[PDB]
């Protein structure tokens, strides 16, 4: 789906079911990486 890797994020907001800002890498522009962020899924620059 994506050529590269997602960054590891070692902090988690202390909330259950945080809001997702994407589901697929395709929900992300350019080097579109839908990844697991600090509080839900967000669009990262890969690795």
């Amino acid at each position: 789906t994506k050529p590269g890797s997602c960054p590891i994020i070692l902090i988690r907001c202390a909330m259950l079911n945080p809001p997702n800002r994407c589901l697929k890498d395709t929900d992300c522009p350019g080097i579109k990486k839908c990844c697991e962020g600090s509080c839900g899924m967000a669009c990262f620059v890969p690795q």
């Binding site: 590891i8 902090i11 988690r12 909330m15 600090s38 509080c39």
Partner: protein, 240 residues
Amino acid sequence: VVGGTEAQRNSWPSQISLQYRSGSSWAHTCGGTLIRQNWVMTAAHCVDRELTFRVVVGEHNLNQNNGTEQYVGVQKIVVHPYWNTDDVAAGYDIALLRLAQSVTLNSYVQLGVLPRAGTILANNSPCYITGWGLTRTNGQLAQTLQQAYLPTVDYAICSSSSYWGSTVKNSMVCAGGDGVRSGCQGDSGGPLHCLVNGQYAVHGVTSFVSRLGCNVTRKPTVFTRVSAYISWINNVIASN
């Protein structure tokens, strides 16, 4: 709260339950602190979504009517202008909610006391985290308000590499990290109560925990240092 005890029914009168409308039902989502009869302080990540919110004051047991509770709709949501939805490590994890109505203060419903702007707690100050959060990593939400003794880890220590290194900012407070006691999912946005010179004040807003677990040795619970936002707080309230 992992490794706590159920709090006495009147121990933390400023503790609120922030809930969202979930079908026809309401779902407990975060903690908060009653700071004015019509204002509540929480985490930005808790109200930075398009949900219908309510606040419950004088709450003890989430599943039973204690008779001490008041339910109030949320009238205004004010998120810190520097808050970035994505980056909780960047800080500015704080929001103020204007209640639809002013609460009645009693034995069970009382205002939370904030610190003087800039107050910095020494290493190992006595604090208590409260909340209805998971009682174990990947466990279930507590039914009754829990509390756990969680002392401060000063910045110099917290930001050291065996702790949170560069993740923790001077605008945050770390407490715990003993691997036994800690905040956990559903505790976010609630208070960190500290005793300083014989007086309690609300010094933290629960923010985040480790990705490896809630209670992780040398991975303290991180909170937004309230004392750093007093002027922001002061202007919002004055004008909203």
